[PDB]
Amino acid sequence: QIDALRTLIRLGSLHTPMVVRTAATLRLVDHILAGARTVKALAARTDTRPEALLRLIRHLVAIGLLEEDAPGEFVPTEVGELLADDHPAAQRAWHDLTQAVARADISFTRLPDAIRTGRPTYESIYGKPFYEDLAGRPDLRASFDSLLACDQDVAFDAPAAAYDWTNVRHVLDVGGGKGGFAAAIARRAPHVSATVLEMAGTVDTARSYLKDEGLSDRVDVVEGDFFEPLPRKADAIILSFVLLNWPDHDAVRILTRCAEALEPGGRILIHERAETADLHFSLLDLRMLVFLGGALRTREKWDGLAASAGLVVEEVRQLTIPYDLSLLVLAPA
Amino acid sequence: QIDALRTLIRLGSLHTPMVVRTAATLRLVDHILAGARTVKALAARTDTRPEALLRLIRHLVAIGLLEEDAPGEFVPTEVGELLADDHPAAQRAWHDLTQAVARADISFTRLPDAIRTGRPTYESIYGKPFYEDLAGRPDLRASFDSLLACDQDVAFDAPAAAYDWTNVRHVLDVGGGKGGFAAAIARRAPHVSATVLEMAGTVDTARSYLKDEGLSDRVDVVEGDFFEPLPRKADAIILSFVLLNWPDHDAVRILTRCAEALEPGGRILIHERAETADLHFSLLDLRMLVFLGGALRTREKWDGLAASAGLVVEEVRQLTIPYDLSLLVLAPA
Ligand SMILES: CC[C@@]1(O)C[C@H](O[C@H]2C[C@H](N(C)C)[C@H](O)[C@H](C)O2)c2c(cc3c(c2O)C(=O)c2c(O)cccc2C3=O)[C@H]1C(=O)OC
Ligand SMILES: CC[C@@]1(O)C[C@H](O[C@H]2C[C@H](N(C)C)[C@H](O)[C@H](C)O2)c2c(cc3c(c2O)C(=O)c2c(O)cccc2C3=O)[C@H]1C(=O)OC
Ligand SMILES: Nc1ncnc2c1ncn2[C@@H]1O[C@H](CSCC[C@H](N)C(=O)O)[C@@H](O)[C@H]1O
Ligand SMILES: Nc1ncnc2c1ncn2[C@@H]1O[C@H](CSCC[C@H](N)C(=O)O)[C@@H](O)[C@H]1O
């Protein structure tokens, strides 16, 4: 009743996440951590009005991201210190309006259009569809790859383990980001070679990362388009968090091109999510609707797509954050 | 540590308030309350895709606004029933993107600009400054007046009581919305007459409301502009939640025009807020920054403005939601 009003007001509140986002984009906590105690030093480091920044700090204190320690000095709280840039969970970057994802969340402001039409709303705001906007803006293209690659060192270890590489000769990582998954498979299967197929811009950072990993001998990088014939056959084609970017009819074209590049005996491996993990799942799934018109799919939806592409789901293996991921294995129907 | 990640993600989350806002704008709960049990009936009442609306409902269930009662039937929770349209707290309308305020919260998406410049960001989005956009869009103009007038029946009773009307002949309600405050003063002081000075559009709804109140005999309505000479003198000039819409230099011009329309012995009465009331206060104050470039002011800020307009603060009286309001009394310096 009395709390029913307060819970709705807090859940319906738009200023609160933009205050956090401004704080991240201003790099407020790093500037506090670099020794800006007063509001005056802090406005001067961030190029902001002193009195407008106090009003933001005041809200930041009241949502728990900041404390007034000495009168006028402001310290990050324990929640607030997750906004430091070197912090392992990368949450400052994921809330930076200057970067690709927190920029893309602005599409949620036209959420009604996406519910009415089913189509993404990103284009209405920024001019081109998600990945064309990145193709034209190298800062956003780069920002996107490092945001998604923020756990490349550990996030592919468990999926790579989950699979038997003994009879695999080559591996095709289709849209494999910076190559972290090809890298994990290389450091577990010492006899396997790999190719990463990615877009312009990303090919150069994946190559640079695989070089500095010591793996340019074993993992190549081909620039290309996975809607066209893949540049070589393989015994394993990896799609890690790719098909969720796409509506069903495009997802099928991707899976068909892979089925064609599949060698005799081959398997297609899909790495994606399953079903506060409901709030984690609901955020990613509403993000795919409003950015790209993709979706997270259930098991019965996968057999649909798979059947439509000439494939069958062999098995589903179940694998750092509170969330279980899946590894779908697909062979010719 | 583990909760530090979850608290930041929830506080930085932009989809969650837009999901609530979409639900309000779609009038989802009223349609459920009018007996749409299934998602199919519900998509057809709201003109939405069935599968996109299930994804929104799914997030609405997980933030507590909805429950799955029978498989596929969805009921509002106790929080969620605050989104019913006839509910006294009017929270459906305050979250409706079609209405003036939830439409204006979109300015919070450019929050960094307001911190850097101190200037409102509403104009950058919608073409004209806040009140010019309303002057051109009668639906928004009307929406704004009824949103602010949602407690006209009770919200002015305590301020009206707090003041002695015995020697007051006339009262000028400067920017008095739909006239609810002139109305409260009339129903307590039976010998006082009043004028409401308001903008185009609002004058007609205030007149209609004061008519249906039985008070068109005692309370007049003049259309006008409070930056120009007021249309008549008075012994009491009321500014209820007006000066917070304005930067200091404009606030002074408003107070100067009032000082001039003040009769011998007169008093200027300012009705505004004071200092989870910190979250209530911080929302209204960041709203005034991003919509109009106004601000909530402390006591020492009031003496500033007051001194600048030729006035002095006589006293401050302290007065339904968890929040204390103030009534400042101002006389010639
Ligand atoms: C924070 C959890 C997760 O990292 C899960 C998930 O990230 C997982 C797997 C991810 N992996 C695919 C490399 C990596 O290990 C990361 C640290 O954890 C995830 C996330 C976000 C995105 C995506 C995510 O996959 C996207 O794929 C994505 C995309 O393909 C295109 C545009 C945007 C995105 C994403 O924003 C994250 C998420 O669910 O946030 C709610
Ligand atoms: C919900 C609390 C309150 O009603 C207080 C406050 O509302 C109070 C006083 C208000 N009164 C001035 C008539 C009325 O009784 C209402 C029910 O409660 C308030 C509110 C909102 C606004 C405003 C508010 O004054 C505005 O004045 C305002 C404006 O002048 C111009 C544009 C927008 C607004 C507002 O959005 C509300 C608020 O603080 O929300 C956070
Ligand atoms: N038509 C296309 N051809 C090839 N790659 C594409 C593509 N459209 C999108 N992509 C790539 O698909 C990737 C999916 S998002 C990154 C996911 C990555 N596998 C990871 O798990 O970290 C993006 O990096 C994008 O550059
Ligand atoms: N230049 C101007 N002249 C007169 N009224 C104005 C004005 N600029 C804004 N206003 C009015 O000032 C009001 C302030 S908001 C409504 C507050 C009202 N007193 C209440 O307490 O309910 C608005 O209704 C708006 O129409």
Residue numbers in the entry:
A (entry chain A), B (entry chain A): 13 to 287, 296 to 339, 343 to 356
Authors' own words:
Tailoring steps catalyzed by SAM methyltransferase-like proteins have yielded particular insight into evolution of anthracyclines and generation of structural diversity. DnrK is a canonical S-adenosyl-L-methionine (SAM)-dependent methyltransferase that catalyzes 4-O-methylation in daunorubicin biosynthesis. Recent studies have uncovered that DnrK is bifunctional and catalyzes additional 10-decarboxylation as a moonlighting activity. Here we have taken advantage of the natural diversity of anthracycline methyltransferases and employed extensive chimeragenesis to probe factors that govern catalysis and substrate recognition.
Here we wished to focus on the second clade of 10-hydroxylating enzymes, since R1 of CalMB differs greatly from both DnrK and RdmB. Region R1 in CalMB is extended by an insertion of three residues and has a Phe to His substitution at the critical site in comparison to RdmB. Despite these differences, DnrK CDDD behaved similar to its R1 provider with the highest yield of hydroxylation product (46%) shown with 5. To investigate if the previously proposed mechanism for 10-hydroxylation holds true for the second clade of 10-hydroxylating enzymes, we solved the structure of DnrK CDDD. The structure demonstrates that two aromatic residues, H300 and Y346, are positioned adjacent to the channel. The analysis is complicated by the fact that DnrK CDDD crystallized in an open conformation where R2 hosting Y346 has moved away from R1 and, as a consequence, H300 does not fully close the solvent channel. However, it seems likely that movement of R2 to close the active site will lead to rearrangement of the H300:Y346 interaction. Despite the different evolutionary paths of CalMB and RdmB, the chemistry appears to be mechanistically similar with exclusion of bulk solvent being a critical feature.
